[PDB]
From a paper:
The therapeutic hormone insulin is a small protein used daily in the medical treatment of diabetes by millions of people. The insulin molecule consists of two chains, A and B, with 21 and 30 residues respectively. In the hexameric form, chain B has been shown to exist in two allosteric states denoted T and R. The R state has two allosteric binding sites usually referred to as the phenolic binding site and HisB10 anion site.
The crystals obtained in presence of urea will be referred to as C2221urea and C2urea while the two crystal forms obtained with thiocyanate are referred to as C2221scn and C2scn. The crystals grown at pH 6.5, from both the urea- and thiocyanate (NaSCN) screen, were found to belong to space group C2221 with unit cell parameters a = 59 Å, b = 220 Å, c = 223 Å. The asymmetric unit contains three insulin hexamers with a crystal solvent content of 64%. In the C2221urea crystal, the zinc is additionally coordinated by a chloride ion at an average distance of 2.15 ± 0.10 Å, whilst in the C2221scn crystal structure the chloride ion is replaced by a thiocyanate. In both the C2221urea and C2221scn structures, one co-crystallized resorcinol molecule is bound to each insulin monomer in the phenolic binding pocket. Each of the two hexamer-hexamer interfaces in the asymmetric unit of the C2221 crystals involves tyrosine-tyrosine interactions between different Tyr A14 groups.
Residue numbers in the entry:
A (entry chain A), B (entry chain G), C (entry chain C), D (entry chain K), E (entry chain I), F (entry chain E): 1 to 21
G (entry chain D), H (entry chain B), I (entry chain L), J (entry chain J), K (entry chain H), L (entry chain F): 1 to 29
Write the structure that this text describes.
Amino acid sequence: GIVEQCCTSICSLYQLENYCN
Amino acid sequence: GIVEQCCTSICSLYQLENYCN
Amino acid sequence: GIVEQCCTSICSLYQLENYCN
Amino acid sequence: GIVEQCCTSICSLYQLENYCN
Amino acid sequence: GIVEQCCTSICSLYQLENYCN
Amino acid sequence: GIVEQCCTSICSLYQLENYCN
Amino acid sequence: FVNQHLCGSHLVEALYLVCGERGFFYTPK
Amino acid sequence: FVNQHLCGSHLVEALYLVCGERGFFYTPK
Amino acid sequence: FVNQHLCGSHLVEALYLVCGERGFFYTPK
Amino acid sequence: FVNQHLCGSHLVEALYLVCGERGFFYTPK
Amino acid sequence: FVNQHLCGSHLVEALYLVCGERGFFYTPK
Amino acid sequence: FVNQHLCGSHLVEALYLVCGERGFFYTPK
Ligand SMILES: Oc1cccc(O)c1
Ligand SMILES: Oc1cccc(O)c1
Ligand SMILES: Oc1cccc(O)c1
Ligand SMILES: Oc1cccc(O)c1
Ligand SMILES: Oc1cccc(O)c1
Ligand SMILES: Oc1cccc(O)c1
Ligand SMILES: [Cl-]
Ligand SMILES: [Cl-]
Ligand SMILES: [Zn+2]
Ligand SMILES: [Zn+2]
């Protein structure tokens, strides 16, 4: 999930956007 | 400045990016 | 929703839990 | 106390330092 | 203390409340 | 720079002030 | 509204802490 | 040391700013 | 409104920063 | 060092939330 | 109320996230 | 990396507060 994707390497704001409603 | 511009109506990511180096 | 409820007066921790999955 | 002193007008870090242990 | 108890392993809010006044 | 100085050891307030305008 | 924007930022942090492993659904609209 | 918990707190803050009025689900699963 | 609540959240931050190893007491009231 | 310093910043945030009107004493020790 | 102060705190956090490796000047008027 | 990223986040907040009306320059490289 997000924690796996984004807590070992930095997620871009676009990558973050994946989790918006 | 940024406070005047962004502290009443929300500045988007896009708008904020104008302040980056 | 959460803004109308919790930004107009302070929500308790139990009130905030309404918004947990 | 701190809320009355510092939430209506800005306290400097030096003023806030009064509340340190 | 708190750093020792809670920076090595996650403390719940319940555990943290032990440090309230 | 600041990351190298202040993310490996804690910078003091005065060290941080080097980065003020 | 910026007031709402700032309030929401604190709301999600509070939800993060209170909800724990449940997570949360933030839907301002 | 507690670094997924701390990372998750920053993650919700960043999601908040990216998502805006859309909102978001945070599911730590 | 929740203005005092949001303010206090920033105050404990700023206290954390300035007080260093001393720590601090936070008592609204 | 820095990771305890960052962690303490979140700890005081969580105490602020959980302790409410009671407030709290933060003392690294 | 210290609204400009609290707003500016969230602004620099937003700038931090948007500007990434480019960094940014914060120069309050 | 993530760690540096989380650290930079607290750094800009500390700069905000310490620098006051002077403002600051955050240049991570
Ligand atoms: O990958 C991440 C983790 C935390 C915050 C962020 O903006 C990005
Ligand atoms: O207009 C604003 C004010 C503060 C934070 C932000 O992301 C936007
Ligand atoms: O009503 C609120 C608003 C923001 C944060 C919080 O813990 C409660
Ligand atoms: O007067 C204040 C209120 C909140 C944060 C701060 O640094 C100062
Ligand atoms: O164990 C911890 C450490 C930091 C914040 C928190 O909510 C819990
Ligand atoms: O060395 C540091 C790193 C982050 C915040 C701070 O006040 C000091
Ligand atoms: Cl705020
Ligand atoms: Cl952190
Ligand atoms: Zn705030
Ligand atoms: Zn952090």
